[PDB]
Amino acid sequence: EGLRVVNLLQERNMLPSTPLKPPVPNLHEDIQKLNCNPELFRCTLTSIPQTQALLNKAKLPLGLLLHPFKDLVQLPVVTSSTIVRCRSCRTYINPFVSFLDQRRWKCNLCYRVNDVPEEEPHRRPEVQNATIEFMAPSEYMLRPPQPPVYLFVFDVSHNAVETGYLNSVCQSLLDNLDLLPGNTRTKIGFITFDSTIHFYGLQESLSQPQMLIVSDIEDVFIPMPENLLVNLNESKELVQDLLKTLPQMFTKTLETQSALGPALQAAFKLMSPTGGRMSVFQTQLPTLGVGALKPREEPNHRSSAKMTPSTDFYKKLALDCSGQQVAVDLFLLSGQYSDLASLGCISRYSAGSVYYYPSYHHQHNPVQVQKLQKELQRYLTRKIGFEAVMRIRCTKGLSIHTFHGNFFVRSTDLLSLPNVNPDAGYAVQMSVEESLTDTQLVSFQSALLYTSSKGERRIRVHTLCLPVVSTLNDVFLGADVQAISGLLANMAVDRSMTASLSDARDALVNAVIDSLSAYRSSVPGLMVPFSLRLFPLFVLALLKQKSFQTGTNARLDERIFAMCQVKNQPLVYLMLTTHPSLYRVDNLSDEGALNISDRTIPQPPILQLSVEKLSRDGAFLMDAGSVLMLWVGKNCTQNFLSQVLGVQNYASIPQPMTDLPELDTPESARIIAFISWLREQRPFFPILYVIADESPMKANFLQNMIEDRTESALSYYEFLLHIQQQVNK
């Protein structure tokens, strides 16, 4: 612990060898113990500024980061014939309510006092679980629970046929047809497209599927009432064949153009009636019909900081899906610019999610291929909610004034979520509308109203209670750097679209300066509170990530996807991404977590992001959350190549190496033991590649040593040096 000040200029080794743990709100031992899980609900200031003035004086942003539908281990399910809720602000009776007349309860959010209905009340599960899930009553639905409908929309143009993604995508569906979320009411559908929209009907009465083609691009329509969206259960055999055929129907195609717009417009109309999930796969820039985008020239490391969408079409179409509880997930496997800065909008406002795969090719990029294999595996077998919505409430005086995430904000905080995934992240920014002089505790509650794949209406609520403070140092003592960082990120993304990448970048540098600069006018070197010791380190890495970096040869579509991830990713993976974890692995040992019964699991220490830490004499794994990159030294140890890599010498370490071998060696067991534990800490299986040779021309590994200097960026010390110069100007 510690209320110590730190001089960033003399330490230079502040980053701990163990994972960082989320702060603990300064709260009475008994309340904190019932507090929500931080991995689900968390605040930037565990210590809430009693007043806005105090909030500003700190110069830190006040907001929340949530991951509500996240996969849980033990989820309490209340089937209460009635849901207990405050008659004024409609807050879900939670663990942080104040019980008095033991037959009445004071709403912790708007202080009104409610009458406990005749249905030890404080022992009721509703008030012993911060994270709970209620069964929605007949009033909580505007229509029979809609069934699960999955419509895939493939782009079958020439380019698209050349990448050969269609093949794997279909094998996945096939291997995971049975594993799709849903009862017997499950509906599935398909549509292909190039210059025309290709529908496919499936009746058990006909010898083979029927490809129905719409060619009037300026006026689409559905070709058949029935059979286009079939009943998986009944039609299993039928669909199974279609998947085994499609990849083969377009091998000698000469269609260069692709009218994605119309396709989607038809995609929409088919779903319109039921709503459901629209999985769209695209591979190039849209050039036919509406939704058409003009090509653009990719920037080089030379051009300065001089993003937004080319047209509104995809956004407009999105709200429409949204109003139909239709969600669109974008899978881009383009090899050239494709204008994601505008395509993304399709998924951004429909609470969908975009998946990117740069230069996807069945033969030419064995990496992306697996990445996809594995991200589809996820996307396909993970739980899903339908026609859901979310509201976030917070104690009187506190106000959410800005949202971050893929959803549509109807009337303040009725976030419409056409679809809800357990990988979707969200953030919010609040301010003090009224001074918290009254209370000494404020709570936040988010309810997730939705429809399970099993046709059940359900609410998922999380509730968080924190303490109000009235002195700077306090605000500072409970600061959560990580969260401040990720929240700033989202504000920056928006900052860039609203203005420019420059301002975005700057405002990020000013958060650090205006902050520590405020800390000083309130206390030689760069002096900061123990909690913000990693504040400049994270913003820097923030400025060097592919979402804000500048001096690089970064292509448009990439930058955009990067900011798409900041926007739709749960703090934890924004960190992994932004600040990979570097572990030296050629010498793992026994200080491991050899607890897990028969497996030991080494616990090597986390290194800071710099080449000064690497060593030609060894191997270093870098965990970036989505992928694991094993860089290897030229002068490595023989033992490592032979007993871990399965090779006789550095020179014969296969160029692209997609995964280590499972050799009968204790060195193998150890490295495989470590790697296995890492991926078990997440649902999205991260690929791993050792291709990181010292000459595989895939050493983008180095792009992560955020602490060194570059011809176009400052070093950590260089950054610290700059900050201090402004802190005391």
């Binding site: 409609r90 009033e139 909580y140 509201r391 009725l414």
Partner: peptide, 6 residues
């Protein structure tokens, strides 16, 4: 407004 049910 299914959540707030007001």
């Amino acid at each position: 407004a299914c959540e707030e049910e007001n």
